[PDB]
Every structure is written in structure tokens, then in C-alpha cells.
Amino acid sequence: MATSSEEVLLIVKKVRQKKQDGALYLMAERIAWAPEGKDRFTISHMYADIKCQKISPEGKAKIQLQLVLHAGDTTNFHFSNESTAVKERDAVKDLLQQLLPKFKRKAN
Amino acid sequence: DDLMLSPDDIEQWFTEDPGPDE
């Protein structure tokens, strides 16, 4: 954990989080985000810190995927990659919904 | 919000998991 000693499950690109373009990196036990062309992740959340997950449909000028944490905080991920947004939006959702039941289990 | 955060135009989701909290 913390260090780059974990495998990457999914690498999403041109993912804008908080109006800034970066990349969405899915990890074995957590989800992280880092701006485009960067090596230092700015956001990191373990699948056990995620309470709920929502998914913003197509139709907007921005496609999104958000994680509602038990703390009340919410991390909405905007897939601004015209070429893989929709496709990666599902890929992340899929991995998340599949990983969540493995980490999410503590009556909270 | 205070600035131009995500809720600038966002809360039209399908909340994949809005029930279980186990």
C-alpha cells in the first residue's frame, strides 16, 4: 500500500476530476487519480471507504462515475476521453461493483 | 458549490448502489 507495490487494475485516461484532466487508475484494493502526464496520484480511496457508487449517463457534455464515501464525501469522475469515455466508464463501474462486495463489509 | 465543482451540473445518476450498506 501507499508505494507502487500494487498492481494496476485499470488505467483510464483524460479523466477530469474537479475540472482538471488526468487519469483514473484502478488498483487492487483502491482507486486513485493522477493528472495527465503525472506520476504522483492526488486522490486515493480504498474500496472499503466507498459507501455507494453512482453513474452519470451519456447525453451531457461530460460523462461521469462517482463514489459516495461513508464519510459523506463524494468523488465524481468525469470521463472526458472522447474515444474511450463511455467504454471506460463501464469498465470502471464493472470493476468497482465487482470489487466493492469484497471490501465493503463492516456495517457502514 | 464555492467554486466550479462537479455539482455545477451533476446529480442525474442511476446510483448503481444506493441501498446495501453492509
Curated annotation (Swiss-Prot), chain A:
Domain of life: Eukaryota
Residues of the full protein shown: 1 to 108 of 548
Lineage of source species: Eukaryota, Metazoa, Chordata, Craniata, Vertebrata
Family, as annotated: Belongs to the TFB1 family.
Name used for this protein in its record: General transcription factor IIH subunit 1
Protein species of origin: Homo sapiens
Subcellular location, record wording: Nucleus
Purpose of the protein: Component of the general transcription and DNA repair factor IIH (TFIIH) core complex, which is involved in general and transcription-coupled nucleotide excision repair (NER) of damaged DNA and, when complexed to CAK, in RNA transcription by RNA polymerase II. In NER, TFIIH acts by opening DNA around the lesion to allow the excision of the damaged oligonucleotide and its replacement by a new DNA fragment. In transcription, TFIIH has an essential role in transcription initiation.
Subunit description: Component of the 7-subunit TFIIH core complex composed of XPB/ERCC3, XPD/ERCC2, GTF2H1, GTF2H2, GTF2H3, GTF2H4 and GTF2H5, which is active in NER. The core complex associates with the 3-subunit CDK-activating kinase (CAK) module composed of CCNH/cyclin H, CDK7 and MNAT1 to form the 10-subunit holoenzyme (holo-TFIIH) active in transcription. Interacts with PUF60.
Gene that specifies this protein: GTF2H1
PTM section of the record: (Microbial infection) Upon Rift valley fever virus infection, interacts with NSs leading to ubiquitination by the NSs-FBXO3 E3 ligase and proteasome-dependent degradation.
From Swiss-Prot, chain B:
Modified residues (Phosphoserine): 6
Residue numbers bearing the Phosphothreonine modification: 15
Motif (TADII): 8-16
Outcome of substituting residue 18 to Q: In a sporadic cancer; somatic mutation
Substitution effect: residue 6 to P: In sporadic cancers; somatic mutation
Impact reported for residue 4 to T: In a sporadic cancer; somatic mutation
UniProt superkingdom: Eukaryota
Phenotype for residue 9 to Y: In sporadic cancers; somatic mutation
Post-translational modification remark: Deacetylation by SIRT2 impairs its ability to induce transcription activation in a AKT-dependent manner. Lactylation by AARS1 prevents ability to undergo liquid-liquid phase separation (LLPS), thereby inhibiting transcription factor activity.
Effect recorded for residue 2 to Y: In a sporadic cancer; somatic mutation
Tissue spec: Ubiquitous. Isoforms are expressed in a wide range of normal tissues but in a tissue-dependent manner. Isoform 2 is expressed in most normal tissues but is not detected in brain, lung, prostate, muscle, fetal brain, spinal cord and fetal liver. Isoform 3 is expressed in most normal tissues but is not detected in lung, spleen, testis, fetal brain, spinal cord and fetal liver. Isoform 7 is expressed in most normal tissues but is not detected in prostate, uterus, skeletal muscle and breast. Isoform 8 is detected only in colon, bone marrow, testis, fetal brain and intestine.
Subcellular localization, as worded in the UniProt entry: Cytoplasm; Nucleus; Nucleus, PML body; Endoplasmic reticulum
Oligomer status and interactors: Forms homodimers and homotetramers. Binds DNA as a homotetramer. Interacts with AXIN1. Probably part of a complex consisting of TP53, HIPK2 and AXIN1. Interacts with histone acetyltransferases EP300 and methyltransferases HRMT1L2 and CARM1, and recruits them to promoters. Interacts (via C-terminus) with TAF1; when TAF1 is part of the TFIID complex. Interacts with ING4; this interaction may be indirect. Found in a complex with CABLES1 and TP73. Interacts with HIPK1, HIPK2, and TP53INP1. Interacts with WWOX. May interact with HCV core protein. Interacts with USP7 and SYVN1.
Functional description taken from the UniProt entry: Multifunctional transcription factor that induces cell cycle arrest, DNA repair or apoptosis upon binding to its target DNA sequence. Acts as a tumor suppressor in many tumor types; induces growth arrest or apoptosis depending on the physiological circumstances and cell type. Negatively regulates cell division by controlling expression of a set of genes required for this process. One of the activated genes is an inhibitor of cyclin-dependent kinases. Apoptosis induction seems to be mediated either by stimulation of BAX and FAS antigen expression, or by repression of Bcl-2 expression.
This protein's domain notes: The N-terminal and C-terminal disordered regions undergo liquid-liquid phase separation (LLPS) following homotetramerization and activation. Post-translational modifications, such as phosphorylation or lactylation affect the ability to undergo LLPS.
